[PDB]
């Protein structure tokens, strides 16, 4: 006669709960899968790529259980501009007797260390191998900077293909090539529709998907039949994530940095402002451990235009108040994931798509803002995303001086003008400020068929610096 909530409570108590992180742990010995780290933070960022109207948030929800908002009335149904997120934990059964394929089970972040095994007949307990964060990416042809920024964030890929539709989906190929651009090679192919399609169509679609990916950079990509609503073949997904995808080399030997993609103003309506919260910027830490209590500044920050037309860049110093990750406020931040940094940054600064694609650095470093950048660029032979009805997919043209091109340096979305075009090198003038940290793998897109279309890749080799104003 025990209520379900008290049952979940005794499960949480028996599972060990969620222990608080130590205030100052020895950071030399902390590996990304330590109990102090992995029980309360995701360490690998997995992103879903696919064509529109195929279902990516639903798949992650079936994996994890955390919903991806889907806000803004009009965007409740069609497409979402900003990235959708969900927390997932990979729990593996410790009992060897139960079959390996169903040992894996993906749970919400609200779960404990050692939850009971839900298979009928198994008293054993699960072990949390790793927490994984899910950076969902828009899969539409208009929103192109967002998916490139998400790819700059994410570390593992899940490609989504429909079964009953046409095999050579161009949006998926564009996404796959975009991931190929930035030194990311772990992609898992996931067939969304398996219930509504036949047995021989299954082999036909398998063969088509195999034939598509033969000459691209990724060669050994696994394929898995999944279903977003039937809630099946989820354990094998976690198995593939565990086995195929390792942790890229990332430690604390590197200087701290941040890359903010989403802005969040914490201003609860109706309640008195005497009890208010700060401004939260959603940023990935690709390098450097962060802790409660720091001085940090965004480099481009305030972008003002004077009476003479010159652009003045005021970096925005801010004292971080908290580092929200997973479910609980943490004391140390584990790099290699999106954490919500809540700081004293003015709430209006975090309201709209203002902190979208912007680099941030802790005090003790000086990232450099650039206004004219020298890039080295390489192109593909054909455009990706165009549906020519049976004729020679649009061939890529060579660049022209004084044209606007969307030059996505990591997460930044910049419309640059071209100054000089060489065979491999070019110079870009940016009215929207951009910053340089080390190399910053860049993506390039242009405009022919209205909406932006990817063309190739670029890497910064030089630039013209603008000193931040104190």
């Amino acid at each position: 006669g025990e209520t379900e909530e008290e049952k979940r409570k005794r499960e949480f108590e028996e599972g060990g709960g969620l222990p608080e992180q130590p205030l100052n742990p020895d950071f030399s010995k902390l590996n990304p899968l330590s109990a102090e780290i992995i029980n309360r933070q995701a360490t690998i960022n997995i992103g879903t790529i696919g064509h529109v109207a195929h279902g990516k948030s639903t798949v992650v929800r079936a994996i994890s259980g955390v919903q991806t908002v889907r806000f803004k009335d009009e965007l409740e149904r069609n497409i979402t501009i900003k990235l959708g997120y969900a927390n997932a934990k990979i729990y593996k059964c410790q009992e060897p007797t139960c079959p390996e394929p169903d040992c894996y089970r993906s749970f919400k972040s609200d779960k404990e260390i050692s939850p009971k095994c839900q298979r009928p007949g198994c008293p054993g307990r699960y072990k949390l191998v790793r927490h994984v964060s899910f950076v969902d990416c828009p899969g539409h042809d208009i929103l192109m900077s967002t998916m490139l920024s998400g790819a700059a964030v994410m570390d593992a890929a899940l490609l989504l293909i429909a079964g009953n539709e046409s095999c050579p989906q161009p949006q998926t190929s564009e996404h796959l090539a975009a991931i190929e651009i930035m030194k990311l090679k772990h992609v898992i192919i996931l067939q969304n529709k398996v219930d509504l399609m036949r047995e021989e169509s299954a082999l036909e679609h398998q063969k088509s998907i195999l034939k598509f990916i033969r000459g691209t950079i990724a060669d050994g990509a696994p394929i898995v039949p999944i279903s977003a609503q039937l809630k099946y073949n989820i354990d094998a997904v976690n198995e593939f994530i565990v086995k195929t995808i390792p942790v890229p080399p990332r430690d604390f030997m590197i200087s701290p940095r941040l890359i903010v993609i989403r802005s969040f103003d914490v201003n609860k309506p109706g309640a008195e402002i005497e009890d208010l919260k700060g401004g939260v910027a959603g940023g990935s830490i690709l390098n450097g451990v962060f802790k409660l209590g720091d001085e940090i500044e965004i480099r481009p920050g305030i972008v003002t235009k004077d009476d003479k037309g010159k652009i003045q860049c005021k970096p925005i110093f801010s004292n971080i108040v908290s580092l929200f990750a997973e479910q609980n406020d943490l004391k140390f931040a584990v790099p290699g994931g999106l954490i919500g940094v809540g700081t004293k940054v003015d709430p209006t600064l975090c309201r709209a798509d203002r902190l979208v694609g912007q680099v941030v650095g802790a005090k003790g470093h000086l990232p450099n803002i650039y206004t004219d950048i020298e890039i080295n660029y390489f192109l593909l032979r054909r455009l990706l995303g165009v549906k020519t009805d049976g004729q020679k997919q649009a061939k890529v043209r060579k660049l022209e001086p004084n044209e606007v091109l969307m030059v996505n340096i990591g997460s930044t979305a910049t419309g640059a003008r071209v100054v000089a075009v060489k065979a491999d090198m070019a110079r870009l003038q940016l009215t929207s400020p951009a910053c340089t940290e080390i190399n910053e793998k860049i993506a390039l897109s242009r405009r022919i068929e209205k909406h932006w279309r990817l063309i190739g890749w670029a890497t910064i080799k030089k630039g013209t610096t603008l000193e931040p104003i104190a």
């Binding site: 398996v194 219930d195 047995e199 299954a202 082999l203 398998q206 195999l210 050994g220 696994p222 394929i223 898995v224 039949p225 279903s227 039937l230 099946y232 073949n233 094998a236």
Partner: peptide, 23 residues
């Protein structure tokens, strides 16, 4: 190697046949 892909497909079809014999 897509050999470990047809197996999950077989499992999915078998689950469908057991759960939904009408289809």
């Amino acid at each position: 190697v897509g050999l470990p892909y047809s197996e999950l497909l077989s499992r999915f079809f078998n689950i469908l046949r057991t759960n939904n014999p009408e289809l």
